[PDB]
TrEMBL record:
It comes from the Bacteria. InterPro entries: AmpC-like (IPR050491), Beta-lactam-related (IPR001466), Beta-lactam/transpept-like (IPR012338). Residues 10-336 form the Beta-lactamase-related domain. This is D-Amino acid amidase.
Length: 362
């Protein structure tokens, strides 16, 4: 179709801007999921990007962790409004933190990401990350305002572990991946995924990478303007805040089932996508968030989903609630600065795709 050529062109043009490669899973109303790729999964071996290449989806992990927690609220063992002192009695301010505050980025919890070395071989535990956050981060008052929190989801992950007697991956696998037949999806803290299948991730030496968000000391020298950042950071360091590996195809399966009421009951789905307040994420299109989903605005269209940034893999997932269109776009190019083209520019082909869908629909 014409939409097919228009979408493929949008991807080609984005790769031609300097992006190494891009993989898209798009699902439209009345149609099967269609996959598109452009550019490379491996820059130096010139291996074409396929719809089978795996990516680190970074904080899109957070939508699955929120889902995991909402499922436990349904099981009846967790209450969104109960104080987390039940699980973390000695966590400062825990009494002023209901369970939901872990999911909505208004907890005021000290964060770890800006302090955590991206280049290491260090294995992390959940508690260790929490300790590291209170050591190096700044705590604000619960409900102070919106400030993106990774710590919140590490704590959510620990509630899941406590309430299920097992790693959070087992709960996510048994309750989300298996039922949906998501065969190309792993939780990197607790599970081994096959690296040979993973698209390589590239960090760009770029002029607009002025204020890097990560400690990337020890990168060594760039080859051909890039670093192969794929195995820089051990996923245990992101834990429940961003440790998942998946394909666009697998992600779009999840989005469809979530929004089609096939995972969470109506009330918990509503908590996730509809019980919203204003939200900000630097460089992004984010305008609001619920309890596990960001609302991201693209002109006259909006995605309910998430963004992901982990060295070299830059992802956008979401459902457009108006048209029923679901998507996951992941490029294997990135940088450190939130406002760098290689990070914030991922929003450009997403914007263009949504206006191409909209144009074929008029
Ligand atoms: N902050 C990243 C996820 C992440 C958390 C912690 C460490 C590394 C990566 C994101 O929003 O996608
Ligand atoms: Ba600087
Ligand atoms: Ba390493
Ligand atoms: Ba509109
Ligand atoms: Ba038209």
């Amino acid at each position: 179709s014409d939409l097919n050529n228009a979408i493929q062109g949008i991807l080609d043009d984005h790769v031609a801007r300097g992006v190494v490669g891009v993989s898209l899973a798009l699902c439209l109303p009345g149609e099967e999921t269609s996959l598109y790729q452009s550019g490379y999964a491996d820059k130096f071996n010139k291996m074409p990007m396929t719809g089978d290449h795996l990516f680190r989806i970074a904080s899109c992990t957070k939508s699955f962790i929120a889902t995991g927690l909402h499922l436990l609220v349904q099981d009846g063992t967790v209450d969104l409004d109960e104080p987390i002192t039940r699980w973390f009695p000695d966590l400062p301010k825990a009494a002023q933190m209901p369970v939901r505050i872990l999911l909505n980025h208004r907890s005021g919890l000290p964060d770890f990401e800006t302090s955590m070395p991206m280049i290491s071989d260090k294995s992390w535990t959940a508690q260790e990350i929490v300790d590291f956050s209170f050591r190096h981060g700044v705590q604000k008052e619960p409900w102070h305002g919106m400030e993106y929190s990774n710590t919140g989801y590490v704590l959510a992950g620990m509630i899941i572990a406590h309430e299920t007697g097992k790693p959070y991956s087992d709960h996510l696998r048994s309750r989300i991946f298996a039922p949906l037949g998501m065969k190309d999806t792993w939780v990197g803290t607790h599970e081994t995924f096959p690296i040979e299948r993973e698209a390589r991730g590239y960090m760009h030496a770029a002029a607009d990478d002025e204020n890097p968000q990560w400690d990337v000391s020890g990168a060594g020298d760039p080859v051909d303007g890039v670093w192969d950042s794929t195995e820089w950071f051990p996923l245990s360091g992101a834990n429940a805040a961003g440790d998942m590996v998946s394909t666009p195809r697998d992600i779009v399966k999840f989005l469809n089932a979530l929004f089609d009421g096939r995972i969470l009951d109506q009330k918990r789905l509503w908590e996730m996508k509809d019980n919203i307040k204003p939200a900000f994420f630097p460089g992004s299109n984010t305008v609001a968030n619920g309890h596990g989903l960001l609302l991201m605005r693209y002109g006259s269209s909006e995605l309910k989903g998430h963004l992901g940034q982990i060295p070299g893999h830059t992802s956008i997932m979401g459902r457009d609630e108006e048209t029923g269109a679901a998507l996951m776009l992941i490029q294997n190019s990135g940088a450190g600065d939130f406002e760098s083209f290689y990070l914030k520019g991922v929003n450009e082909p997403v914007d263009r795709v949504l206006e191409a869908i909209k144009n074929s629909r008029s």
